[PDB]
Amino acid sequence: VKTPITEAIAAADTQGRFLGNTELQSARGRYERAAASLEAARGLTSNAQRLIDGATQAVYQKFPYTTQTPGPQFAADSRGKSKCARDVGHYLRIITYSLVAGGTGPLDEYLIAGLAEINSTFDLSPSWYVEALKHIKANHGLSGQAANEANTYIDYAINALS
Amino acid sequence: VKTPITEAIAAADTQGRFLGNTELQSARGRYERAAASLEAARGLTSNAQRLIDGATQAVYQKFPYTTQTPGPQFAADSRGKSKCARDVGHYLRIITYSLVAGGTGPLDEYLIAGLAEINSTFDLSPSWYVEALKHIKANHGLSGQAANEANTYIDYAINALS
Amino acid sequence: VKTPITEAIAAADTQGRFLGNTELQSARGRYERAAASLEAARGLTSNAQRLIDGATQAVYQKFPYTTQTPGPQFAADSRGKSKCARDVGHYLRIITYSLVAGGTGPLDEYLIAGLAEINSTFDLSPSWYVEALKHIKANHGLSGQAANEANTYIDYAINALS
Amino acid sequence: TLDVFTKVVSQADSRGEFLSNEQLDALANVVKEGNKRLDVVNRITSNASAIVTNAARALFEEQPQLIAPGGNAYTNRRMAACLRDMEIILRYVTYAILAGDASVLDDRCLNGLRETYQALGTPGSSVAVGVQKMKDAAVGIANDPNGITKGDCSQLISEVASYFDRAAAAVG
Amino acid sequence: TLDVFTKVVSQADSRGEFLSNEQLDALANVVKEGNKRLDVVNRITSNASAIVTNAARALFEEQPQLIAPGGNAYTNRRMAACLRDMEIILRYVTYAILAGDASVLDDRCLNGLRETYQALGTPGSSVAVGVQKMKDAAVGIANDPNGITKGDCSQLISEVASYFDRAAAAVG
Amino acid sequence: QDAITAVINSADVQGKYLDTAALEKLKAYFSTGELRVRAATTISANAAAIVKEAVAKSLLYSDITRPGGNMYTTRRYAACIRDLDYYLRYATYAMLAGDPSILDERVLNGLKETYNSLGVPVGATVQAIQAIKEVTASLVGADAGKEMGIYLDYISSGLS
Amino acid sequence: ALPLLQYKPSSQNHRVTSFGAADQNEDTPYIYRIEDVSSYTDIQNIIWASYRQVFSEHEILKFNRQKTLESQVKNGSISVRDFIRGLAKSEAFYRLVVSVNNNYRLVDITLKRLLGRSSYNKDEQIAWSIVIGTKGFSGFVDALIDSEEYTKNFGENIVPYQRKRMEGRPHNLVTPRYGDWRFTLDKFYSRKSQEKQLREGDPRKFADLAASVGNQGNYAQRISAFDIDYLNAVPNR
Amino acid sequence: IVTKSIVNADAEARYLSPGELDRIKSFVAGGQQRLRIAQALTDNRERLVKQAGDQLFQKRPDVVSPGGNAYGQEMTATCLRDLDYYLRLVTYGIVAGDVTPIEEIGVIGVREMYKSLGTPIEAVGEGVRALKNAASTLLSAEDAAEAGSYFDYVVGALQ
Amino acid sequence: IVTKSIVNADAEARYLSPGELDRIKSFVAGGQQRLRIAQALTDNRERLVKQAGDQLFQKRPDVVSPGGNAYGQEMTATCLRDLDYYLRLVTYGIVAGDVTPIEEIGVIGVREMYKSLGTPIEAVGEGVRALKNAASTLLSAEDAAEAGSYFDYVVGALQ
Numbered sequence A, B, C: 001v002k003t004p005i006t007e008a009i010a011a012a013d014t015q016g017r018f019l020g021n022t023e024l025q026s027a028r029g030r031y032e033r034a035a036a037s038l039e040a041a042r043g044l045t046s047n048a049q050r051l052i053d054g055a056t057q058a059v060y061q062k063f064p065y066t067t068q069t070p071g072p073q074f075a076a077d078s079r080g081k082s083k084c085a086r087d088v089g090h091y092l093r094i095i096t097y098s099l100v101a102g103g104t105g106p107l108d109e110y111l112i113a114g115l116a117e118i119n120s121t122f123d124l125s126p127s128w129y130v131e132a133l134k135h136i137k138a139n140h141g142l143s144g145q146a147a148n149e150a151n152t153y154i155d156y157a158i159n160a161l162s
Numbered sequence D, E: 001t002l003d004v005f006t007k008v009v010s011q012a013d014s015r016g017e018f019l020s021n022e023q024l025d026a027l028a029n030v031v032k033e034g035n036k037r038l039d040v041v042n043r044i045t046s047n048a049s050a051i052v053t054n055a056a057r058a059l060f061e062e063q064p065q066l067i068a069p070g071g072n073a074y075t076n077r078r079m080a081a082c083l084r085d086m087e088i089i090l091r092y093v094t095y096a097i098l099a100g101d102a103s104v105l106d107d108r109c110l111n112g113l114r115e116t117y118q119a120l121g122t123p124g125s126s127v128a129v130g131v132q133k134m135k136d137a138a139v140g141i142a143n144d145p146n147g148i149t150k151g152d153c154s155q156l157i158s159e160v161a162s163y164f165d166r167a168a169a170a171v172g
Numbered sequence F: 001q002d003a004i005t006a007v008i009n010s011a012d013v014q015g016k017y018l019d020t021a022a023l024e025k026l027k028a029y030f031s032t033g034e035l036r037v038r039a040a041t042t043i044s045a046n047a048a049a050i051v052k053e054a055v056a057k058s059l060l061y062s063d064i065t066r067p068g069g070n071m072y073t074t075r076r077y078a079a080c081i082r083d084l085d086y087y088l089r090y091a092t093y094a095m096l097a098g099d100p101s102i103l104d105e106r107v108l109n110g111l112k113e114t115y116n117s118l119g120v121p122v123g124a125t126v127q128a129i130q131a132i133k134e135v136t137a138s139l140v141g142a143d144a145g146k147e148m149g150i151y152l153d154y155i156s157s158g159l160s
Numbered sequence G: 001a002l003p004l005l006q007y008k009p010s011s012q013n014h015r016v017t018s019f020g021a022a023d024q025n026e027d028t029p030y031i032y033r034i035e036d037v038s039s040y041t042d043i044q045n046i047i048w049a050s051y052r053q054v055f056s057e058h059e060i061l062k063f064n065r066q067k068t069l070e071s072q073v074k075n076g077s078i079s080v081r082d083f084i085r086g087l088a089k090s091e092a093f094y095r096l097v098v099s100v101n102n103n104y105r106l107v108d109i110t111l112k113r114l115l116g117r118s119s120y121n122k123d124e125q126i127a128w129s130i131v132i133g134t135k136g137f138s139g140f141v142d143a144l145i146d147s148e149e150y151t152k153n154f155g156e157n158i159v160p161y162q163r164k165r166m167e168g169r170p171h172n173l174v175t176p177r178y179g180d181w182r183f184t185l186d187k188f189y190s191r192k193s194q195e196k197q198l199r200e201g202d203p204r205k206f207a208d209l210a211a212s213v214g215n216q217g218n219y220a221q222r223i224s225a226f227d228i229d230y231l232n233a234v235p236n237r
Numbered sequence H, I: 001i002v003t004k005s006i007v008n009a010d011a012e013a014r015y016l017s018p019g020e021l022d023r024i025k026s027f028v029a030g031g032q033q034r035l036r037i038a039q040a041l042t043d044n045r046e047r048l049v050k051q052a053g054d055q056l057f058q059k060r061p062d063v064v065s066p067g068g069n070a071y072g073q074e075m076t077a078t079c080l081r082d083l084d085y086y087l088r089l090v091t092y093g094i095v096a097g098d099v100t101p102i103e104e105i106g107v108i109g110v111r112e113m114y115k116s117l118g119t120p121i122e123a124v125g126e127g128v129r130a131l132k133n134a135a136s137t138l139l140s141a142e143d144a145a146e147a148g149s150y151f152d153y154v155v156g157a158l159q
């Protein structure tokens, strides 16, 4: 799992040398940054049920296909729509994890590590999630600087999808 | 590129030993089925334009989505429909190549070697091609034994897609 | 141990891919050969004592040297002549093993794997066995196609000797 | 790696005598049955990915703790590892179908396989639930006759049901 | 590695169009001629060590400077290396006989082979003397009828004389 | 005439009864009549599409449809379509009869006289009949396309 | 069976001691050890950096990676040195490198990808060439990994890496795995069809006018023939 | 097919030649298969019109486009009613065994009707081709051949 | 060679004299070697055109020079196409056994054609000589003799 503190560790450990001043400034940058990221963390957990059910409906509006045709892949049945809030409910968790971690670490392992191999099997088209996140990109309602950094991890998961 | 003759070569070359009787029977087997696969090869090239335009329309019938929404990925414009006969026109080429080669060799390199990485980028959903081939699986009109071996390389490309 | 079926396995296992059509045709060839090779197998076991004592005397006729001079290497004593039917009795076993295995597998491990290192030590001259087998090559009495394939494994052991 | 041809060799080598004509006539079934072996593996590997994804909805049908949060098949890397191991049995099964004897599956698939589930924490006995939930789809795809000439394919289907039964019993 | 089946593919792939029924009928010789390929390689490799040691007495018949003291094939290590390379051509020849096209022999046997004789000091042109002193024994063993039913393999035979002629010309 | 009627005529002018070779000929015709009828049905399906594809393959965008060419005037284009429809229809009749005598009796009788009288180019007609033959051999399959191409090449050879 | 003939080692960067462990620049490669796993993303980094040395980044693909070997490495059943052997003795390596490369070229490429060291001179490439030809390719790869230059320097459980590349070009970029008269006359045929002159009354003259008018046709209505209810929808009069 | 042989022998002064009696006896024998094929196409009509409209409007979208004739719900309902009419005439021709009672009601003056209605005839031919494909999927092989017979006649007639 | 004897005995009113029948029987016997030689020259065509262009442009560099005719890629492609044509006619003459179907297509009016094209004929003769040398290296001794026969006819004809 990646973290700008643990990047200062593993780069110092493979060299076999101590923690010089050139790794402490790496940790130092994150501390200033973390306070800012936590304001984006409180902005998302307060809007948990608002963003999920807003973005889940935002998929069905642009894609009326997945609500109609029968199949285990789509969400014509309620168990598809129940698993709809499973995925996008799990997407906003790791985005809130990646902001509090300060890095792309938990977003790397938990979400995008094997994501290109599941979607080839279960017929989950990645254009579904990539525009689910675009609704979260526009409707999180954050402002200031934390609106940019919460926007950073969203379109990092987009480039992993596409 | 893989071939049951060239599998008898490279297995004999890494051992550093001659062509014994245990590699000549490998090429012997291909000769027995060589006549059989070529009858499937003549069955497909005679139906070139029939199978391609039949399967391309077979995608649009089950998927009315890709014909309607604007975008560079789908085929709402004619240049999408022009590139529709590009892909499935190229799919039936390598299937006819894999039958005359006697192995999955040219189908390995030409088609399925980097196929899992393009479709993650260009938003080409692999469920489009996997049911394009199912129309070719049913409507090739072949009979006898060559209908089975032409059916073999089709659902080998299916398992590479899904 | 080598077999055209197990060559289709280990070539499929190092690639890390399934059993495609390009390994099933390798086992197809052996089956046709197996019926033919078994007719050579019945031709040799019925003539077990005829071929061994025929070829053992065929060594002494061309080589009157090994029957006369005293030494532990040659067969002046009866214990040499008792170990004469040991070796050529063991030679015809693995030839009958290599026909039923369909490959040069058991002939590789059981006979010719360390054969170049024993004969440098025990003063067993390999020209003795290489003309013992030539008597078995001519006097097996087989006909048709099985006479060729039983002739194949004989002069595979010849090229390993010389 | 072994065979039905080379286990007969090694059975005869440990005796150390020529093969009898009683022995080879029983082996002459296999050159006749090699017509029947060679397509039942071709039937499985043609529909290999259909078996895996349909039986991925069968273990996950009955035991919904696996995509429960905190489950062992829970996360995306873990679930991609489930599919990584859902067909790592099928290649080792179809190797034993072509070879005809299970000495390939027993030193590459099941040799010490039970040991890792006591090491990682993943439930061993749950894999044995879903593996024989493959064989009813594996036999059911391999048995039905459409197009192919009628034949007694029943005889080695009991072999195919035996190899899944061996591999499931030696996991849980 | 290439074939007569896969060079036809790569010839058609660089055109990028389906294979014609005129094209496949010419390829239907090879499935008939595969009966004739498969034993002419079996004839060579059965008598492989007889060809090498008899042609070791032919280059060394005509050019006795090689076991002369100071020669390049002189010492025991060097002479064992001659036999190490006297049949390293025969496996690469018999690979091209089975494949039917010389793209295996041209990237493994002859690709830069001439360069080492200008590097080591061993005479390049002398190997080309003894290599086509193998083919009169190679063709002469592969052509004579004993046991096998009479058939015309003359067309196939020219191919075998062409591969030795290609390999000898690209050394010296 | 038929293949049946030709066999009966060849047996009749000798006064011969129906010997076994004639019965072989009639039984071969009764074997091939299946694909004969199926081919005639699917050629009667889309004759206009075949003629359209043939002129788009061979005659269109040439100098023949340009001014100065023989297909410039629109009545001459309609006459061209009529002649190609005639060739395809009578080739269908000769395919189902299994005997090219109706081509000799109804099409190829005074046709070179007419085409040299009107100044109709003969080589372009031969290439158009060739394109007709390729299109219908693709459309019907190879096995009936051989017999269709035999009578279309008969028209092409008699025209030249 | 015959020993390797004695050849010429040239002077190069690797031979030098490069004393100390505080002294190296950062550019020295991150020597991924299987012993310091820490978290999954060091396993994923160890596996990916093994592929990179062997396949030069672009290849990873999907098909090329043996998925089974990666799983075993995490478990620890097979050492990393055993794993690169299984990668180099793979046919996804063999159809990639060996089929395209010469024998003498293959010595240079495999020494740069498995041993991280360029070939000394040409005669070192000539000396090992005989070994590949008689032992097989997996006879030679198994002779590299067992060799004393590999086991002292890379140890049992380190991925290989270019050593002491301070004044050199990275090996992957510098060296790759690689090594028509009828076409130019056919393009002569296409250029001589455009140069005559378009004949009077052509379709191309009015083509420009069509572009000027524009007017792409109307889009699809989208009403479906299953929901038209045509028996009720037809009106009388 | 009996009216065909009757007016055929009626233009002549001869009776019905007994080869014509053989063809009438054979048609009388095959009438049961004809009736089963006609009932199978009868009860499944709305599926066939649905799939024909599907395949046609996927094939030619200009009838959907507002410049074309079948624009709007009323015009597309008239379009599917025309396809229903042609399926009905195909069932009539399947029962009658010969294409006279279907050409008399649907073919003999169709070109000038569709010309003075504005609709193209090639789209109608593609619609009957879609009906033939859907009925080929609905029936068995020997039934789809014998249905595609008369469907093929209509497709050749509309062109 | 059969047309040669037939028109030879046809100018006379006599039949084919049986010595001509002996030469036809001997040509019929040698036809298998002729077919093998023609197929060996057939499958290896691009090698022969490559080595012929090699030896020609090494021998005469004026076609390469801009005053010569074969200057540029298009003109040098036309040059190698001419060499391909002459190799094709040589294979025709190898099968036919006598030089009539190759002289009828490549020899009988070649001097005025190459004169009104600007190219020299001696360079074409050197190109066919290079083709003969490359085919002599490609074939065995009794095959290269019988190929150099017709190649020799072309070289004598172009001069």
Ligand SMILES: CCC1=C(C)/C(=C/C2=NC(=C\c3[nH]c(/C=C4\NC(=O)[C@H](C)[C@H]4CC)c(C)c3CCC(=O)O)/C(CCC(=O)O)=C2C)NC1=O
Binding pocket: B056, B059, B066, B072, B073, B074, B075, B079, B080, B081, B083, B084, B085, B086, B087, B088, B090, B091, B110, B111, B118, B122, B124, B128, B132
């Ligand atoms: C020789 C084997 C071979 C194949 C088959 C192949 C396919 C292939 N199709 C592509 C795009 C495409 N593929 C399609 C095809 C489709 N999209 C649809 O909407 C339809 C559902 C479907 C056709 C039935 C389209 C429309 C594009 C362009 C998409 C884009 O530009 O984003 C691309 C990426 C861009 C390109 O170069 O054109 C590749 C590489 N490449 C290969 O080398």
Ligand SMILES: CCC1=C(C)/C(=C/C2=NC(=C\c3[nH]c(/C=C4\NC(=O)[C@H](C)[C@H]4CC)c(C)c3CCC(=O)O)/C(CCC(=O)O)=C2C)NC1=O
Binding pocket: A056, A059, A066, A072, A073, A074, A075, A079, A080, A081, A083, A084, A085, A086, A087, A088, A090, A091, A110, A111, A118, A122, A124, A128, A132, D067, D074, D075, D076, D077, D079
């Ligand atoms: C913790 C991070 C994490 C996520 C997000 C995740 C998603 C995930 N969603 C899945 C299936 C699914 N995903 C969806 C979701 C959707 N399909 C639709 O139709 C909609 C367009 C869309 C929701 C907006 C559905 C309906 C299924 C079930 C599909 C099936 O069973 O085939 C599957 C495979 C089966 C499963 O265990 O349930 C995974 C692994 N897994 C993870 O480990």
Ligand SMILES: CCC1=C(C)/C(=C/C2=NC(=C\c3[nH]c(/C=C4\NC(=O)[C@H](C)[C@H]4CC)c(C)c3CCC(=O)O)/C(CCC(=O)O)=C2C)NC1=O
Binding pocket: B033, B145, B148, B149, B152, C021, C024, C025, C028, D035, D036, D038, D039, D040, D042, D142, D143, D144, D145, D146, D148, D149, D150, D151, D152, D153, D154
């Ligand atoms: C549904 C249960 C069932 C099965 C499984 C079945 C299989 C089956 N495969 C057969 C034949 C065969 N099957 C194959 C198949 C192949 N040979 C090869 O070398 C290829 C690699 C491979 C195809 C990819 C061949 C070549 C034959 C020869 C006989 C024939 O043409 O049917 C036959 C002929 C009759 C017999 O063997 O007794 C049977 C029974 N029959 C059944 O009733």
Ligand SMILES: CCC1=C(C)/C(=C/C2=NC(=C\c3[nH]c(/C=C4\NC(=O)[C@H](C)[C@H]4CC)c(C)c3CCC(=O)O)/C(CCC(=O)O)=C2C)NC1=O
Binding pocket: B023, B024, B025, B027, B028, C145, E035, E036, E038, E039, E040, E042, E142, E143, E144, E145, E148, E149, E150, E151, E152, E153, E154, E156, E157
């Ligand atoms: C890969 C293992 C393998 C081999 C080796 C093989 C050889 C082989 N050669 C055969 C025939 C033959 N092989 C030859 C070959 C020749 N006759 C001559 O006089 C020439 C000098 C020479 C060619 C230069 C001939 C003439 C036949 C006759 C039958 C046929 O046309 O196949 C046949 C026909 C079937 C049989 O003999 O039972 C076999 C099996 N088949 C195999 O499966």
Ligand SMILES: CCC1=C(C)/C(=C/C2=NC(=C\c3[nH]c(/C=C4\NC(=O)[C@H](C)[C@H]4CC)c(C)c3CCC(=O)O)/C(CCC(=O)O)=C2C)NC1=O
Binding pocket: E057, E060, E067, E074, E075, E076, E077, E079
């Ligand atoms: C510098 C060290 C060195 C030695 C000693 C050496 C020996 C040597 N002796 C050879 C042959 C031979 N060696 C002998 C010698 C003998 N055969 C007999 O019958 C006698 C028992 C015995 C002598 C006492 C003979 C007669 C030949 C020729 C055999 C043949 O041509 O097959 C050969 C193979 C052919 C050759 O080049 O002549 C070598 C390499 N080579 C070396 O580089």
Ligand SMILES: CCC1=C(C)/C(=C/C2=NC(=C\c3[nH]c(/C=C4\NC(=O)[C@H](C)[C@H]4CC)c(C)c3CCC(=O)O)/C(CCC(=O)O)=C2C)NC1=O
Binding pocket: F064, F070, F071, F075, F076, F077, F079, F080, F081, F083, F084, F086, F087, F090, F106, F107, F108, F111, F114, F118, F120, F121, F122, F124, F125, F128
């Ligand atoms: C059943 C056998 C049969 C044929 C073929 C036939 C042909 C025929 N073609 C004619 C004219 C024509 N025929 C052609 C046809 C062609 N010119 C071309 O450039 C093309 C190469 C070719 C069309 C493929 C044309 C252009 C005319 C018009 C001459 C004119 O009327 O001014 C005419 C003059 C009167 C008229 O069309 O109504 C006859 C009689 N009559 C027959 O009974």
Ligand SMILES: CCC1=C(C)/C(=C/C2=NC(=C\c3[nH]c(/C=C4\NC(=O)[C@H](C)[C@H]4CC)c(C)c3CCC(=O)O)/C(CCC(=O)O)=C2C)NC1=O
Binding pocket: G010, G011, G012, G013, G014, G015, G016, G017, G018, G164
């Ligand atoms: C066994 C044969 C052999 C030699 C000789 C050898 C030399 C060698 N000298 C080096 C550097 C160097 N060598 C020098 C040498 C000198 N500076 C001076 O002023 C003097 C004139 C001179 C020494 C007398 C310097 C200053 C460097 C470091 C240059 C740099 O890093 O920019 C390096 C790069 C760093 C390293 O030591 O690994 C190598 C590989 N390698 C070999 O394998």
Ligand SMILES: CCC1=C(C)/C(=C/C2=NC(=C\c3[nH]c(/C=C4\NC(=O)[C@H](C)[C@H]4CC)c(C)c3CCC(=O)O)/C(CCC(=O)O)=C2C)NC1=O
Binding pocket: D059, D066, D072, D073, D074, D078, D079, D081, D082, D085, D086, D088, D089, D108, D109, D110, D113, D116, D120, D121, D122, D126, D127, G068, G070, G071, G072, G073, G074, G075, G076
């Ligand atoms: C109930 C459904 C279900 C399954 C099946 C499942 C499998 C699963 N297999 C795993 C690892 C693994 N699984 C294997 C399996 C194998 N290695 C081989 O070579 C063989 C082919 C095969 C054994 C037959 C290995 C080696 C690992 C660990 C690989 C590594 O960590 O490097 C992991 C990683 C972490 C952990 O185990 O706790 C999971 C979650 N999880 C689930 O929820």
Ligand SMILES: CCC1=C(C)/C(=C/C2=NC(=C\c3[nH]c(/C=C4\NC(=O)[C@H](C)[C@H]4CC)c(C)c3CCC(=O)O)/C(CCC(=O)O)=C2C)NC1=O
Binding pocket: E059, E066, E072, E073, E074, E078, E079, E081, E082, E083, E085, E086, E088, E092, E108, E109, E110, E113, E116, E120, E122, E123, E126, E127, E130, G005, G103, G126, G127, G128, G129, G130, G131, G133
């Ligand atoms: C697969 C293609 C291929 C070939 C052919 C090849 C040849 C090759 N021949 C070699 C040496 C040699 N080759 C010879 C050969 C000969 N001496 C004679 O008198 C004869 C004329 C001739 C053999 C017929 C000798 C004596 C040496 C050792 C020279 C020395 O060490 O000075 C060496 C250096 C040592 C070694 O074997 O590794 C190579 C690499 N390598 C290849 O990859």
Ligand SMILES: CCC1=C(C)/C(=C/C2=NC(=C\c3[nH]c(/C=C4\NC(=O)[C@H](C)[C@H]4CC)c(C)c3CCC(=O)O)/C(CCC(=O)O)=C2C)NC1=O
Binding pocket: H056, H063, H068, H069, H070, H071, H075, H076, H078, H079, H080, H082, H083, H085, H086, H089, H105, H106, H110, H117, H118, H119, H120, H121, H123, H124, H127
């Ligand atoms: C049973 C014999 C029979 C036929 C053949 C027939 C045709 C027929 N088609 C009509 C209209 C129509 N027909 C169509 C036809 C089509 N939609 C298209 O785009 C395609 C070209 C085609 C069908 C897929 C359309 C769009 C109209 C309405 C045109 C209008 O209102 O002007 C009308 C006028 C309205 C009416 O009274 O129904 C008649 C009479 N009527 C009959 O009784």
Ligand SMILES: CCC1=C(C)/C(=C/C2=NC(=C\c3[nH]c(/C=C4\NC(=O)[C@H](C)[C@H]4CC)c(C)c3CCC(=O)O)/C(CCC(=O)O)=C2C)NC1=O
Binding pocket: I056, I063, I068, I069, I070, I071, I075, I076, I078, I079, I080, I082, I083, I085, I086, I089, I105, I106, I110, I117, I118, I119, I120, I121, I123, I124, I127
């Ligand atoms: C099969 C019978 C046959 C012959 C003999 C033949 C000759 C022939 N040579 C031509 C051109 C040419 N031929 C050459 C010839 C040569 N390059 C040189 O320098 C040498 C003198 C010589 C060949 C090595 C050149 C350079 C041109 C192009 C000249 C030009 O464009 O004016 C052309 C005109 C362009 C074309 O349509 O190909 C013809 C017709 N064509 C035939 O169909």
